[PDB]
Subunit: 341 residues, 4 copies
């Protein structure tokens, strides 16, 4: 008889409804349709197609789907972002990172659970672009706050794992006397950094290298930074190369630059902490973030574990801070300002 | 300042939270972890790993993620399905079809929007397995209802586009005198049909062929069916081969078998119908279904368009029915019982 | 041990969380705090208190609660509506009607279920004010559409059950030649109608009487209307007085005014229709509306039942319409344009 | 045109949909219909009406409403709880307390905001009954944990503000040597306590008085307790009588009973703590709880404020604990075990 089944089905597949919507919102941003709708205000599928080189029947399908979900409005003149659609704008970075960057990673979990199946891959270009969008809200303000508490002034900044160069673009626009150098291991991210830096008019003050963090420190680069930023880099080295390699990397920084100020941003691994995991942002962001870090060759550890690593590498903690409680009040994103002990 | 940003962020990325959960639920089913948890009641990660040949640290990560979302419970003895987790069981087919089958298709939409980029691909084995799970609730009862209104009795049943053979297994178990033949174009689905039929003990009464519908009708098969079931097949032929090809296919059926009873199940294309699109199941299922059918080489049309096609092919409508309002009350899934005019 | 209980509790009491939010949104509107925040943009609790004659500590409590839910933002200068708070503006009428008008009614259901316990009461002033706010979106445009399809032009309009007079104020502003008379049985609503009409500068063209519909038609009023609007009035008479009384009331209208055009708006009782009840607006609005009409002395019937009543009363149907599918696509709100047969 | 309005309306009035559902769930429990459906499994409206003395048409309305929301199932034999309906069972106390007890309080906020309008009233009988239901999960296990850490064993227990006597019934059943006395100021709650104690067969070991806490301590009662439980009582005295009155009350306890063990349960006022307020249970429960305590004559203060009050009253802290993180992981419900300094 299946009495009452339909009502249970609508609730039971609610995650599937939102799964498709998240992918569709990701494409709305990534394809530049969102920016086109902002610019035009109202656009017919024919006009959007001509501008972006798209096929009308596929675009009409995406537009009708988004209209049914309330992201778009449709009038005789075309489609427009609704108030709900406009409200998505600040969140672009999260969609680009988690859907663009990590959709393949989540999809690979079934096969990668098998003995010997290896680590899940990701689209590191989208991870970098997306995380840089996110960093405008959380990590860049945190880095700025810690930099203000260091002695002297920043004149030469080195950012390892720079993604598309957003930290360097923001710091260079706010602090005009700064000279900067960024290194990014992903080729696509490296190319996006060279383009963003050129678009912001900063190519004469900021240079980008296609390199990983450990290999950059071992290279014959000619730059004497007084600040080094390691934003979510150490947990990649920890997973890929091991704890002795992280300790040795940190020792090499202060051996080469004994008066340097280090700013390290890391995520505290509280995946098993019942109270922490009930916070709305812990469920929305950190629970999937922790899951991805079990399937990729990265290792998140606790605040106490990082403090032990810093001590073993011969570093002293100047101050520790978390993100503004207006943006992320979980206390899981922690920034450390360190110096040679 | 970003005043109040966090509250907006938690709401803004709610689709991303559910996107990861839908993928994780899909893997919970597809990897056979769900069936393992049902069988064991409580299983430690070590026990689940030994049984399914998995890696403990990756499995613990998936389990902790699902525990944080309330799908699993954790005690000193291990993990178990919660009441919420147990409640997901009937919906397995939807997760397998839409996530397993069509996740790649949704992910390809950005690139496939470009002029000349072609049709998005899918994992047709998972689409078939998943849709067959769904059909237990909606399409198999609808087919059974229409079959009861035809003259005479079914003795020889042909199912084109049979997926994993679920329609044939259910009809053969309910009606022991039936001899059946199924054709499935996807190799993986064909192999799953041969295995399901063997598992149900029906290999002596039901034969499966690896073939598409049009090519099967043109083959030298030796079977005289009195019923032919075309469950969501015609809209594939319509998209791939065109309307004259669908008309010619239907004419060939009644030319070869003039006394045959045809049962056709199709989805009415009401993607642009405001009232229809506000139904909870229209939003949860049909809105993504319509979107997928704009990106794949399949074409959904309206009830009136199908009736015109049937008339042009020389068929008469015996009766038309929709699914039980206990399972799907949208009126979008329509079954037609036809005969030669 | 209560393993996993908290996660189930947060979901289990979600209706309670939203119950308090709905009441708080209702007071935000009803107390004029919403209009104060629109006017001021940012207001400290001291400024809001001085303007509306409120107590600071109670207001701070309401504001902190709403801030926690994302409806308000707080800065050093005070509180303001967030984008989410601003987006609530069009829905004021629904909150005023269902919470202000009918909260007591829903709360009385337990006691009123008992044999001989009578009908639940309501705050008819808030029901009238709120329903008039709603009517701007659905019933006023429907009435306007039907009036345009009548053979005659409206010059003298009678609105029975006029609430706060919003139909008359809108029609009179749009159609300057109209003279109008409204009757409202609730004293509080009647007083709000006299005030709204005076505020809109329409007291010379619109008169309001404190009276129920049946008693108004039996009174010595001196007005010769060519249009009468009965917007959700007949189902009140049907419940309170019975079907013969509704038939007699309609017969009396066309006996007194044989050339009159009648516009009747009613809600189709589809409470037991599985497909209709899965529409998002059916669940949000019509399911509680049907419930309240089982506990108050009002009786909702079906479209066909109304058409039969009209035939018995000697009325002919000119045309029937439902609301615009941009505002309400359920087809449950129906308007009938009638004349004497 | 109101383009796209309906989609915004369905979301905008979601709090109203859940507001009516919460009230309907409250009555389902409070009227004993929930227990009737558990006992019968399937019940026709006629059978439920005969058993509880209800009117069939009003009951059918409530049942149809709940069926539409998925709480009930309907078959030819009658109505039954669905799996979703069954899952509500543990949450009865929250509905009884917040809806039964405090619905009137929330509804009174608009009028009580006015200068000199006084404190909002509540249904203290339902607050007591509901809070006692909740206490089975959080406060009773917390009290039991603290009692076990005292140097003495409990033989004579006094519970001030006992509600319906649930703490005493649970402790007395688990610990057969205990003699107990409870005081409850609300007459309805007092009568429910006398009945619960009689139903559990404990009238020979537990006596209940109709009295407030301060007046009980000033009375001529003849009982020498070695443990006193003050579960959410002190914040009532603090609001109603002031901080000197709370200090004097605590001093009087240890003057009359110098060897007594005191167990105090209080809610930490973190209403203004951004991170704490993003916890799912903080939003669902504590945010409305804080709001109600701004409109009633009760005053919630912080953990540190309570510890300072205890020091002033001449009490020493033996140990402090919060609730089990399986039931409430906010850390806002705190229990203190105290002795005379
Ligand atoms: Mg990482
Ligand atoms: Mg298809
Ligand atoms: Mg009514
Ligand atoms: Mg009634
Ligand atoms: Mg209290
Ligand atoms: Mg108070
Ligand atoms: Na890893
Ligand atoms: Na297609």
């Amino acid at each position: 008889e299946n009495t009452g089944f339909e009502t249970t089905l609508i609730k039971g597949i609610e995650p599937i409804r939102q799964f498709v919507l998240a992918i569709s919102i990701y494409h709305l941003f990534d394809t530049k349709l969102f920016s086109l709708l902002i610019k035009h205000e109202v656009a017919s599928p024919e006009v959007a197609c001509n501008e972006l080189g798209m096929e009308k029947e596929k675009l009409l399908g995406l537009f009708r789907y988004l209209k049914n979900e309330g992201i778009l409005l449709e009038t005789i003149d075309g489609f427009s972002l609704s108030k709900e659609g406009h409200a998505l704008a600040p969140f672009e970075g999260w969609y680009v990172m988690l859907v663009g960057g990590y959709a393949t990673t989540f999809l690979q979990m079934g096969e990668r659970l098998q003995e010997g199946a290896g680590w899940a891959t990701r689209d590191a270009t989208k991870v970098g672009v997306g995380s840089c969008g996110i960093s405008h809200f959380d990590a860049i303000p945190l880095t700025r706050s810690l930099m203000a508490q260091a002695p002297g002034t920043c004149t030469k900044l080195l950012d390892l794992g720079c993604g598309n160069g957003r930290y360097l673009a923001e710091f260079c626009k706010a602090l005009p006397q700064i000279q900067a150098w960024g290194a990014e291991p992903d080729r696509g991210g490296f190319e996006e950094a060279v383009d963003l830096i050129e678009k912001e008019g900063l190519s004469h003050r900021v240079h980008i290298s296609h390199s990983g963090a450990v290999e950059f420190l071992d290279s014959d680069f000619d730059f004497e930074p007084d600040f080094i930023v390691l934003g979510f880099v150490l947990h990649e080295i920890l997973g890929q190369a091991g704890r002795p390699a992280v300790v040795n990397f940190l020792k090499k920084i202060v051996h080469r630059f004994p008066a340097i100020n280090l700013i390290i941003i890391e995520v505290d691994n509280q995946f098993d902490n019942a109270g922490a995991m009930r916070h709305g942002l812990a469920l929305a962001y950190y629970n999937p973030y922790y899951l991805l870090h079990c399937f990729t060759n990265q290792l998140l550890v606790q605040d106490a574990d990082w403090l032990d690593i810093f001590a073993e590498a011969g570093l002293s903690l100047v101050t520790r801070e978390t993100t503004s409680d207006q943006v992320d009040s979980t206390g899981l994103e922690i920034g450390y300002l360190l110096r040679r002990a």
